[PDB]
Symmetry: C5
Subunit: 270 residues, 5 copies
């Protein structure tokens, strides 16, 4: 894909918006606990660790279809959509400002309940193809649900970097975050941005505004280029753990809004 100049003129710009609902484990909108995982089922040992699919947060992904650009496909150059900038926001942050939800008391039974807190993971990506993933787990002896996309035939090497443990973020709510992360050795045509704070009871911290833009251009001034006129939006927004009265625990996720500006870019015809 030899990249040429930006196409100028009227209607060289377009703009899309989308939202991605979280995939915390309860991933059906009819689910009573939609937006949460089911009760974390903990390993009994190193050898015996079979997390339920409903307990494992996965990446969200959506494909946005863009307007057709080329008529004559036999020419020397073609146009592709180039993602230039994005405004993105985690929605419903203030829903966490809630001390009455059933759960564990902060102090005794006269007090409010512990709000969602603990480990957080926030990531968004904008690309002209699927986000390229690298596999790495806390334990290679974990048995993952066969309906999810995880690493095939793990060995202890998979607790670190195994260069064969690669995948594409090409299915919504299927790739667990505890197995997959963005592959920095690839992703030339995607931009991804991530933030992790761990711990079991850590206070979550989030900002929200409509005044902030991220520019997506690389050091050659080129944004993600949308193969087949498709734009890939990916996210995970784990905002912590909700603790229940029995002390069972559910992951809590929040949806993410994207507003992307794209322009026309000239490329050599492959």
């Amino acid at each position: 894909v030899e990249v040429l100049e930006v196409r100028t003129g009227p209607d060289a710009i377009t703009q899309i918006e989308a939202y991605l609902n979280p995939r915390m484990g309860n991933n059906n909108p009819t689910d009573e606990l939609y937006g949460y995982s089911a009760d974390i089922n903990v390993a009994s040992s190193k050898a015996s660790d079979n997390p339920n699919a409903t307990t494992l947060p996965t990446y969200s992904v959506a494909v946005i279809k863009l307007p057709m650009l080329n008529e004559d496909m036999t020419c020397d150059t073609l146009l592709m959509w180039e993602a230039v900038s994005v405004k993105t926001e985690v929605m419903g942050i203030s829903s966490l400002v809630n001390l009455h939800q059933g759960g564990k008391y902060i102090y005794g039974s006269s007090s409010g309940t512990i709000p969602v807190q603990g480990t957080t993971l926030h990531m968004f990506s904008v690309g002209g193809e699927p986000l390229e993933l690298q596999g790495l787990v806390a334990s290679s002896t974990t048995t993952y649900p066969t309906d999810m996309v995880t690493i095939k035939n793990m060995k202890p090497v998979n607790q670190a970097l195994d260069p064969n443990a690669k995948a594409l973020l090409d299915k919504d709510g299927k790739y667990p975050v505890e197995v997959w992360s963005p592959d920095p050795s690839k992703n030339e045509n995607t931009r991804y941005y991530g933030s992790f704070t761990g711990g079991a009871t850590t206070p979550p911290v989030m900002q929200f505004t409509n005044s902030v833009t991220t520019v997506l251009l690389d050091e050659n001034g080129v944004g993600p280029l949308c193969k087949g006129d498709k734009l890939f939006l990916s996210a995970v927004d784990i905002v912590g753990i909700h603790t229940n009265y029995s002390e069972s625990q559910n992951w809590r996720g929040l949806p993410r809004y994207f507003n992307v500006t794209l322009r026309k870019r000239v490329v050599k015809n492959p």
Copy 2:
């Protein structure tokens, strides 16, 4: 509406100032605990969660009527454009207090635990009501009917339901735990918010008169005041006060605004 150029000349600029008092639950100035919520009443289960109206912090909103700009058939009209804002949370040092009745830090010889835990700060300046998206921790919660909440909730309301939208058009009626600013709209409002969770988290706040936020968008256009009305919205939950019996009350603080506005030409629609 097609936005044209900034109107120059004498008297092109004006300033307004306002303060919004907090709406934590006790929302009447004669309430003993004005500026606080009542004792949080907790759900007994997923199915049974009936929070009292007085326990749910809501958004503050005020509408500022600006000087009338157009007497109406001319081909262009003028609108007030909010260009910048100085905003401040007032009475921060009020929380620097270890004698207020409450729960002892250590044993009964010590000071009491000051306001701490979850904080939520938001301000917005817009030319029309702030646009809101509904999302809740639990769709089986029964909200007081006197408040404005999501009609006919389903589990989808625990995440993004594009049908759950509203306008912040009433002071002290829209619960913060139910509504947040809608990033898919709000072209004519600028909003800024920060959240830090937890049950005992130390609150952190700055105060100064040296800082200004510029409200202009990427085209150099600030919010434009429809019908010459400026909408100022806020919430500043500064934490949780814990009482001796361990009952808890949200504590809020008031917010000052000083907004500078200029005259903007628009094509008459």
Copy 3:
């Protein structure tokens, strides 16, 4: 006053320095716990809350006499000193690095003692007149010592913004910080800068250098103008709470240094 241009030429710049001692409650330098509050006395209830004067930290304020400027008061223009910039420093920070002071053991009786920690409040202001204050309290039912300056005839409204609850910081060690804060609806002729972290055991965080300057000019390039050739310096620097063996507690404060550079500014005669 209508402000005009800066006066150029020789002797048009001056510079002052001052320090302000903290007013934590023990405010007499002969007091045994000078620089600390007395043991905090706690409310027994909502209705019954009578904090002792020696337990309530108050703002520091000093007036600095500047060189007299206007020989002829009938002139159509006059000169005022304009505060341009300030270096300011909290002094004796390292005095907190002390684990042997009598107090509460960190662990058992073999360990050091708990250093000063908890709620901190830092504020400095430079103005050409007294800092204007707004009243707001945790509880309107609190009975304050009568020989302090507080809100007269409080009602529950004073737990929020009562527009009638106003004052000037015109007395050193008289205005409790828990009652008064800088009023953002005025203070046109003062710059103030403030920083709060709460909690009961929070670690204090402080910087110290002689390499940092704060410019006092507003958006029109005008600094505080010193009425009657007087410069007002105000401060509070609560660095936390010292816990005693019996678990009684004292607020701890530190003095603040000011170095202000001023220039002559032409104003129209009123």
Copy 4:
């Protein structure tokens, strides 16, 4: 060597990429706890402190062989000059896991405590081995024989002993708790380091492919690759995993490097 100007023209730039696997103590890819240390064995006293080799995290290092530049007679020669690097800690989200066997957050119905506590991140890019300075918590520790540590330690080694120097010239052999980058040397390497201590501190990390670090010094010169060899070094201890018995293992993560190099003219010495 006298350093002259940058060589321009076609084919003057090159990129390499590599990843370094962590060396936490279990350092063989077939080890059950590869990517972790073994259970920490604690000293019985000041005098009796014999940490097992598998319990001591060490630095990672890789040598990248670059294209040969010289066909050695001439007055000037060429060297590879490292200009910039993109680096990334991989598999961060693997820590977002509350079901791994371990210690319960609350009682036995809760999730388990994730990796937390002390973290140490370092990467370096240089034209030769990273130069190290020795300093320990205790000179009466007896280190495993098969590791490289300070010979004939004395109490002076609990602070700066100018004789205690080394080169990071072996992967998984130099303990982090013994060696750190020597700021009095390393003129031909750039290193960047971050430490947060504590027993149970929440780990914090970001990840992106939008960030580049420029390696040029104040004279605009990057590390120069002696013998066409580029040295990449790292450690990324991300915290401690606590087991059900309360035994503890260090946990590390691998680091990706992408380095851009150019040709630099130097005088033939």
Copy 5:
């Protein structure tokens, strides 16, 4: 002294490097606990507080003698002007150690609590001794007489006594809990300091060789070296080590300095 222009020309620039070992109380390189304080001895009362010399961390200071620049009989003279410094706290990774004898994180199967709690970092570069201000937590404390502390203390010394001044003119003698840099003086020194308190706070430090601090003031003048002497001062308390019995030792680390200096013209006094 009237300061004139910078001397341009060849050989106008010089560089020095140095390191300062910490003085935490065990200040002798043969001390078993070199680089730490002795076990903190606590006051039994307000009235009775006698910290041992070995439990009180003190400032480090070195004097670097620079090349002689001047004949003293000419209209103008030259002084060395400190222009910039690279500085580094060394052996940071030595804290990354969970096996050192101490207090268990959990029960006796776990690692031990690492150095944590109060930290104090300061460095200064000056052309004469750092000027100090005295201020103490308690005026009734009896300091060791062979240390340099405030003479005849009164309760005024718990705040600002303008008479309580000193010079940092001796290594390992001036306690940090008594003296701090005096902002009312030090026109010929640049000092930079950071404090975080608390008893168990995680320590946080960076290390790199890519960062320089410029020492020029607002007039573009760096510290001027009187009698061709450069003063380097430091303290780097990195936390508290807790022992098995719960006794506690301050822990310090050494600091490296690399200072660049230039020739400055001054009028002969």
